[PDB]
Structure formats: structure tokens, C-alpha cells
């Protein structure tokens, strides 16, 4: 129907929002990786303190 000059049927808008969903998933995964790094770090301290 039209090129990227509508923002609701535009191609650019489409591709943008898909890429943003990707950025939200990627962000979430990134956070979780950080969190389990935090956890592991702690577990080292927990076991140490336990000794």
C-alpha cells in the first residue's frame, strides 16, 4: 500500500519496532546473565564464610 512514510503501515516503523522487541529480549537476557554472575559471586562468598 505504501512505503515507510506512514509509521503505521510504513516499513521503517515496522522494522524499527521489531528491532526494539529484539532489544527488549536482548536486554532481559543481558540482565539475567548479570544476575547469575552476581549469584555465583555471592555463592563463593557464602561457601567461604561457611568454611
Amino acid at each position: 500500500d505504501n512505503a515507510a512514510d506512514c509509521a503505521d503501515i510504513g516499513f521503517d516503523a515496522q522494522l524499527k519496532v521489531v528491532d526494539e522487541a529484539i532489544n527488549q529480549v536482548s536486554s532481559q537476557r543481558a540482565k539475567l546473565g548479570a544476575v547469575q554472575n552476581r549469584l555465583e559471586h555471592t555463592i563463593n562468598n557464602l561457601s567461604a564464610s561457611g568454611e
Binding site: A3, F11, D12, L15
Partner: protein, 51 residues
């Protein structure tokens, strides 16, 4: 009705294309013309009018 080929991965990485040829593709002002510049491709004057 311009033609948008996607060319790159991201937004706007694209081009435009157009085309026109048919029977009425003789000399084009904005339309072809009236009694001239349309028939010359479509209907030749080579009926008798050269005589």
C-alpha cells in the same frame, strides 16, 4: 506508485524505481499529445497521408 527495493538491513536502506512503455509511448509532453505523439507509436500515418 514508486518501486521500493530493500537494499540494506536497516530502515531506509532502499531505493526507488519507475518505468513506462506501451502503445502510447511516443513523444511525451506531460501527456503524450493529442492528434500527434500518441498515434505515431500506436497508429501510424502510413495509411495514405504521405501521399
Amino acid at each position: 506508485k514508486n518501486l521500493v527495493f530493500q537494499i540494506g538491513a536497516n530502515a531506509t536502506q532502499q531505493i526507488s524505481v519507475n518505468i513506462e512503455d506501451m502503445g502510447a509511448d511516443a513523444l511525451g509532453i506531460k501527456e503524450a499529445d493529442g492528434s500527434i505523439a500518441a498515434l505515431h507509436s500506436v497508429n501510424d500515418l502510413d495509411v495514405t497521408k504521405f501521399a
